[PDB]
């Protein structure tokens with residue numbers, strides 16, 4: 001998730017809780033307030049894709 | 050919480066770093082700043098004066114143009130024409146909205 005889109009050749013290393021609603025979460029993980037960097041799930045028996 | 054850019058002279062070097070610094074409220078250097086975190090780029094190279102600069106930031110690059118001339122006024126800008134040659138083309142990759150200049154003070158009046 002991100003607020004606005006990226007520019008060409010722009011990188012973003014941000015560790016902040018992103019509010020998906022109206023309540024402000026000052027460093028609080030909660031509901032409509034989560035962590036943007038979700039990991040991948042690479043296991044070898046997955047299909048191609 | 051965001052990355053930043055930093056250019057320092059010592060009258061012997063240029064220190065360009067794109068780490069993730071935490072800054073003061075009066076950042077200066079005494080006649081004197083180094084603290085990094087998650088640092089992704091680093092670059093080194095080598096009133097009668099006037100030095101002019103142009104800074105642009107577009108598509109991941111930071112453009113700098115420069116020219117310096119001897120001048121003989123008191124506290125103005127001259128009347129003639131002088132064009133600025135290109136200097137360097139740093140591939141920094143960040144977002145910039147604000148900036149601030151750095152000075153050389155004699156004592157350390159850290160406020």
Ligand SMILES: *[C@@H]1O[C@H](CO)[C@@H](O)[C@H](O)[C@H]1NC(C)=O
Pocket residue numbers: 057058059061062064081082083
């Ligand atoms: C000038 O300062 C920078 C950083 O403060 C340093 O890396 C550089 O070596 C200095 N040059 C000197 C002390 O000649």
Ligand SMILES: *[C@@H]1O[C@H](CO)[C@@H](O)[C@H](O)[C@H]1NC(C)=O
Pocket residue numbers: 013015087
């Ligand atoms: C620095 O960045 C790396 C990846 O870019 C990350 O793993 C690490 O947690 C960061 N350090 C912090 C947030 O203090």
